[PDB]
Amino acid sequence: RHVQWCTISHLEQKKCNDLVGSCNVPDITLACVYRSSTENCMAAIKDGQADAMFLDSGDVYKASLDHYNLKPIIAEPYSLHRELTKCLKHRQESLGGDKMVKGRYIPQCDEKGNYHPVQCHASTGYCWCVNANGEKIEGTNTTPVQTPPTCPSQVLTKCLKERQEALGGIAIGRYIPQCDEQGNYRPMQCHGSTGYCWCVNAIGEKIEGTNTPPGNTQPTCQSHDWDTCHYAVAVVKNSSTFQFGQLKGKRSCHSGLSKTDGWNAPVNVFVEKKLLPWDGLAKGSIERAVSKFFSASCIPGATETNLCKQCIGEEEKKCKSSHDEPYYGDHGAFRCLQEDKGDVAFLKNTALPDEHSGVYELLCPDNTRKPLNKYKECNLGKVPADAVVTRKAGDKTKDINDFLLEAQKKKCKLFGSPHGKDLMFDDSTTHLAPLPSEIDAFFFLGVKWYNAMKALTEDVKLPSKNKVRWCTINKPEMMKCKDWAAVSGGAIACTEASCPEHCVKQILKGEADAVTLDVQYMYMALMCGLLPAVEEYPNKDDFHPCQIPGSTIKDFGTKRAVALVKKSNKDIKWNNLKGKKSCHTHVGDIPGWVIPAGLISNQNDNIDIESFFGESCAPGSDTNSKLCKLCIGDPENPSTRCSLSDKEAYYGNEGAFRCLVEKGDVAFVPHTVVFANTDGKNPAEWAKDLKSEDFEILCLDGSRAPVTNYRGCNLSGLPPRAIVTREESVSDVVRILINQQSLYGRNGFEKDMFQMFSSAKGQNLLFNDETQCLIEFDRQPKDIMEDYFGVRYYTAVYSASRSAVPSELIPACTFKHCSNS
Ligand SMILES: NC1=N[C@H]2[C@H](COC(=O)NS(=O)(=O)O)N=C(N)N3C[C@@H](OS(=O)(=O)O)C(O)(O)[C@]23N1
């Protein structure tokens, strides 16, 4: 196994070559491939000449476009503010679940708010070991008949870990970090031998401008600093006296044309302050307008002559996006100011001097100047993290992650070098961790910074707030949507994707505006930040909420999952279904499987619904399991048993009701199946005048109820299907869809020209054909999960937690960003 690292300079290739010698990662060999600039390396990676490089967030965006097709895979974790610990968050969630779902696991936290390494489930007496995230170490479960397991201690905090490491087995003459009672870093740190002191934030990163030799006054250190985003700054010497608003005509040093801190951040502010006569691409290129602003500059990678005049690279190296240009990058631009080739340098806080005292200070955009350690209040914006990138195909992602994880374990010299600063990686880097597997540049940079860097390259025509771009998941849907657009007078347009999750992505990225989602995609949509705009109202018995919008809705008409038993079976209650014989409509059904499997899992320590029951029928399971024993294949015997077809006599709503009456004690079905198959409503012989007053439903409190009281004695009601959009577009989509409904709904004034809720092109296109109308979602002041799902369903299926991961998109779309206001 090989990893080929692309380097951009002779200096960086030197450091990479040293790593090949010094860093011994078994199973994976590093090699180094030289190219002359950042862009030549991007192309080398695209072409397979190399596998990975580290990119500034501005280059991350550039590499993500079709020219190069690279994606970020590894970056340093950062933090925006202090958060609740995980254990305390989990406690709060589960205590907010549905109290009628009895016997749920409530985590046990310790005096620092972490998980006790032994976790227990009160109602079952089972204990197990957990990791720091509170996730069960599988195979450590012990039963109440046994003593609690012996679980290893939790991993130490960063500060306590690095303290114990530094001590080895007192470490004389070396820094030993000082930790607070919570095990985080004390704000002030001192070197126990040199006498120097400085400030750190809560995770131990140094605050620049605070390093203090002994005998001097130290700057005040802020406590509880969890904002570890990097900030773009403008740095100047204290011997000059201009302010930010007087930058016109000065000499400037920039980290580089493609860097977010050297280009995007300052240009963004130059434009917001109208220091720059530029606003759109009709006014020329931004680089040209900047060329008219400064007199001479060093901006590596530029083409305008004055914007390279101040660089000092020899011959073809001059003004190259490469360390062979001595003024390239953050520490290059600072050097350019130091040697007085510029009056101001544009870089980021992590490249500022460590020492408090000296000739440098910060130029604030509000036309004041402030000390180096005040960058959080004197900056040109937070900027995104930087990242290691590879091909979008990801053929080398695992080898790159393995190598860097193991090199970091062995403490290889990744993050400094005698040959120079910021070679291969930023010298300020401390750890590189893998990014979510579905991350791309949009989700890594965040919509705000992504749009901001797009905005400097093209005129981004924002689509109209009076048009809803509907996202379709198959060709018949697209055709029905084009017919809607033709009568809509421009209010409706169409986009095409392959599945609902890709529609969610398009809505997030501003390529579409709305889509109808089945219940099973809503957790993912709500977790990514979309909101229900309107919902499908399916109650055929009441059209009043559809006639007069805004009206009160007595019953929304959604199905309610119930547990169905015969009145003859007086001994069975909810609390004793273990080992009984159960009938499921099929594996994957929500009212007959997901809702029951969720409740069994929450009350029995995730013990399989397979093992929970005795002999059952659940079409879709493997034919050899105890979930197919009750399954009667086909009356016309063929290889049709436990099958996902009407071949299986026990498949579906009515089929599970068969399995109950024939050979079973309980069936999980919607509340409608019994009424559709009793009172002689089904002609078949087995339901021969079978009486609705011959069955009951099981309540979760151990009681029972006649099947007519499904409203207050159900496993869980389902939520309606929902039309979701971005938070800011809810009001638009509601207004447009309600107007369309008055024209083309079931009582539409123009229903002869188009019908929203049916079609000849197929079934349930865009909306479900049984929809009565779309009802605006009345947002309540509670968690959106509880608001949309209802507490019962949220608890039953997701444990009332925001931490389930039904889709691998969720970790990408919830990734946190470094954006401004
Ligand atoms: N904000 C809000 N509006 C409701 C409508 C449906 O309204 C009924 O279901 N009507 S009703 O007559 O049957 O109550 N949409 C939802 N997805 N919800 C979930 C339900 O959760 S519930 O609280 O478990 O019903 C709800 O809260 O109603 C509701 N939450």
671 CA → ligand 1 middle, Å: 17
Contact 619, 595 (CB under 8 A): no
Residue 437 DSSP code = T
221 CA → ligand 1 middle, Å: 50
Q: Measured between alpha carbons, how far is 144 from 644 in angstroms, rounded to an integer?
A: 39
437 CA → ligand 1 middle, Å: 35
Q: Measured between alpha carbons, how far is 533 from 814 in angstroms, rounded to an integer?
A: 21
CATH topology of domain 468-547+719-813: D-Maltodextrin-Binding Protein; domain 2 (3.40.190)
Q: Which residues pair with 212 in a beta bridge?
A: 197
764 CA → ligand 1 middle, Å: 23
- The structure tokens 């019994």 sit at 674
561 CA → ligand 1 middle, Å: 15
Q: Measured between alpha carbons, how far is 54 from 52 in angstroms, rounded to an integer?
A: 7
**Which residue has its alpha carbon closest to ligand 1 atom 9?**
556
Structure solved using which method? X-ray
Q: Measured between alpha carbons, how far is 412 from 343 in angstroms, rounded to an integer?
A: 38
Query: Ligand 1 pocket, 360 CB below 6 A?
Result: no
- Long-range pairs, 454-460, Cβ under 8 A, ≥24: 454/61, 456/264, 456/267, 456/268, 456/286, 458/281, 459/280, 459/281, 459/282
Q: Measured between alpha carbons, how far is 324 from 11 in angstroms, rounded to an integer?
A: 7
Residue 536: φ, ψ to 5°: -75, 115
CA-to-CA dists, residue 147 to 119, 124, 580, angstroms? 13, 14, 30
Burial of 279 (0-12, 13-18, 19+ CB in 10 A): exposed
**Which residue has its alpha carbon closest to ligand 1 atom 5?**
777
CA-to-CA dists, residue 368 to 185, 265, 268, 272, 379, angstroms? 32, 18, 19, 17, 11
Q: Which atom of ligand 1 is nearest to the CA of 532?
A: 17
Orientation angle between helical segments 286-293 and 265-272, nearest 10 degrees: 70
Q: Measured between alpha carbons, how far is 727 from 279 in angstroms, rounded to an integer?
A: 28
Q: Does domain 230-383 correspond to CATH entry 3.40.190.10?
A: yes
Q: Measured between alpha carbons, how far is 433 from 77 in angstroms, rounded to an integer?
A: 7
**Which residue has its alpha carbon closest to ligand 1 atom 12?**
555
Q: Measured between alpha carbons, how far is 740 from 751 in angstroms, rounded to an integer?
A: 10
Residue 474 DSSP code = S
- Report the residue numbers after which the chain has a gap, meaning the C atom sits over 2.5 angstroms from the next written residue's N, or none: 169, 638
Query: Ligand 1 pocket, 510 CB below 6 A?
Result: no
790 CA → ligand 1 middle, Å: 6
Contact 97, 791 (CB under 8 A): yes
Residue 725: φ, ψ to 5°: -155, 180
718 CA → ligand 1 middle, Å: 9
**Which residue has its alpha carbon closest to ligand 1 atom 21?**
790
**Which residue has its alpha carbon closest to ligand 1 atom 22?**
790
Q: For residues 257, 260, 263 and 268, what is the CA-based torsion angle, rounded to 10 degrees? A: 150
Q: Is 680 helix (H, G, I), strand (E, B) or coil?
A: coil
746 CA → ligand 1 middle, Å: 23
Contact 254, 311 (CB under 8 A): no
**Which residue has its alpha carbon closest to ligand 1 atom 10?**
556
CA-to-CA dists, residue 300 to 124, 130, 393, 478, angstroms? 65, 50, 30, 47
For 235, the enclosing helix (H) or strand (E) is strand 230-237
Contact 720, 558 (CB under 8 A): yes
- Joined together, the tokens standing for residue 141 give 């479960």
Q: Which atom of ligand 1 is nearest to the CA of 553?
A: 12
Query: Ligand 1 pocket, 806 CB below 6 A?
Result: no
Query: Ligand 1 pocket, 535 CB below 6 A?
Result: yes
Contact 320, 313 (CB under 8 A): yes
Contact 585, 666 (CB under 8 A): no
720 CA → ligand 1 middle, Å: 8
- The structure tokens 């995104």 sit at 384
Q: Measured between alpha carbons, how far is 522 from 515 in angstroms, rounded to an integer?
A: 11
742 CA → ligand 1 middle, Å: 23
769 CA → ligand 1 middle, Å: 21
Q: Which residues pair with 495 in a beta bridge?
A: 471
Contact 259, 302 (CB under 8 A): no
Q: For residues 700, 706, 712 and 714, what is the CA-based torsion angle, rounded to 10 degrees? A: 50
How are beta strands 230-237 and 344-348 bridged, if at all? antiparallel
Query: Ligand 1 pocket, 712 CB below 6 A?
Result: no
Q: Where in the chain is the domain with CATH 3.40.190.10?
A: 2-78+385-455, 230-383, 468-547+719-813, 560-717
Contact 336, 345 (CB under 8 A): yes
- The structure tokens 């917001």 sit at 272
Query: Ligand 1 pocket, 553 CB below 6 A?
Result: yes
Ordered DSSP codes for 136-193: B-TT--B-TTSPPP--PPPPPPHHHHHHHHHH----TTS----B-TTSSBPSEEE-TT
Query: Ligand 1 pocket, 792 CB below 6 A?
Result: yes
Q: Measured between alpha carbons, how far is 574 from 382 in angstroms, rounded to an integer?
A: 54
522 CA → ligand 1 middle, Å: 14
- Choose which residue among 534, 553, 556, 723 to substitute to test ligand 1 binding: the one with the highest number of ligand atoms within 8 A of its C-beta: 556
Orientation angle between helical segments 500-508 and 519-528, nearest 10 degrees: 20
**Which residue has its alpha carbon closest to ligand 1 atom 20?**
790
Q: Measured between alpha carbons, how far is 323 from 329 in angstroms, rounded to an integer?
A: 8
Residues 6+ apart with CB under 8 A from 237: 337, 359, 360, 361
Residues 6+ apart with CB under 8 A from 337: 235, 236, 237, 253, 343, 344, 345, 360
- Joined together, the tokens standing for residue 427 give 């010298």
Q: How many CB atoms lie within 10 A of CB 86?
A: 18
719 CA → ligand 1 middle, Å: 7
553 CA → ligand 1 middle, Å: 9
Q: Which residues pair with 739 in a beta bridge?
A: none
For residue 265, which of 348, 341, 146 has the smallest C-alpha distance? 348
Q: Measured between alpha carbons, how far is 490 from 351 in angstroms, rounded to an integer?
A: 52
**Which residue has its alpha carbon closest to ligand 1 atom 3?**
778
Contact 268, 452 (CB under 8 A): yes
- Joined together, the tokens standing for residue 117 give 């390494």
616 CA → ligand 1 middle, Å: 33
Give me the sign of the Cα torsion angle 386, 391, 395, 396: negative
The backbone region for 308, taken as left when phi is positive above 0, alpha when psi lies in -120 to 50, beta otherwise, is alpha
- Choose which residue among 531, 788, 797, 798 to substitute to test ligand 1 binding: the one with the highest number of ligand atoms within 8 A of its C-beta: 788
Query: Ligand 1 pocket, 78 CB below 6 A?
Result: no
Query: Ligand 1 pocket, 711 CB below 6 A?
Result: no
E strands, 646-777, where? 666-670, 695-698, 704-706, 716-717, 722-726, 773-776
**Which residue has its alpha carbon closest to ligand 1 atom 23?**
790
Query: Ligand 1 pocket, 551 CB below 6 A?
Result: no
471 CA → ligand 1 middle, Å: 25
Q: Which residues of 115-143 are buried (b: 16+ CB within 10 A; e: fewer)?
A: bbbbbbbeebebbbbbeeebeeeeebbbe
Q: Which atom of ligand 1 is nearest to the CA of 555?
A: 12
555 CA → ligand 1 middle, Å: 9
For residue 162, which of 127, 204, 133, 105 has the smallest C-alpha distance? 204
* Resolution number, Å: 1.9
Rounded to 5°, the CA angle 694-698-703 comes to 105
CATH class of 560-717: alpha beta
Contact 142, 126 (CB under 8 A): yes
**Which residue has its alpha carbon closest to ligand 1 atom 8?**
556
Distance of CA 709 to the CA centre of its chain: 40
Contact 686, 658 (CB under 8 A): yes
For 488, the enclosing helix (H) or strand (E) is helix 475-488
Q: Measured between alpha carbons, how far is 344 from 353 in angstroms, rounded to an integer?
A: 15
Distance of CA 87 to the CA centre of its chain: 20
Q: Which atom of ligand 1 is nearest to the CA of 788?
A: 17
Q: Measured between alpha carbons, how far is 658 from 687 in angstroms, rounded to an integer?
A: 8
- Long-range pairs, 133-142, Cβ under 8 A, ≥24: 133/86, 134/86, 134/87, 134/90, 134/107, 141/605
Rounded to 5°, the CA angle 783-786-792 comes to 155
**Which residue has its alpha carbon closest to ligand 1 atom 30?**
787
- Joined together, the tokens standing for residue 806 give 């039904």
Query: Ligand 1 pocket, 536 CB below 6 A?
Result: no
241 CA → ligand 1 middle, Å: 63
644 CA → ligand 1 middle, Å: 32
- The structure tokens 């002779």 sit at 10
CA-to-CA dists, residue 124 to 104, 109, 144, 224, angstroms? 9, 19, 8, 40
Query: Ligand 1 pocket, 780 CB below 6 A?
Result: yes
Laid out side by side, the sheet with 433-434 consists of 53-55, 387-391, 70-75, 433-434
Query: Ligand 1 pocket, 538 CB below 6 A?
Result: no
Query: Ligand 1 pocket, 786 CB below 6 A?
Result: no
152 CA → ligand 1 middle, Å: 45
Q: Does domain 2-78+385-455 correspond to CATH entry 3.40.190.10?
A: yes
- Choose which residue among 595, 787, 789 to substitute to test ligand 1 binding: the one with the highest number of ligand atoms within 8 A of its C-beta: 787
90 CA → ligand 1 middle, Å: 25
How are beta strands 560-566 and 29-34 bridged, if at all? unpaired
How are beta strands 297-298 and 252-254 bridged, if at all? parallel
- The structure tokens 């109950």 sit at 660
Measured distance between the N- and C-terminal CA atoms of the chain, rounded to whole angstroms: 45
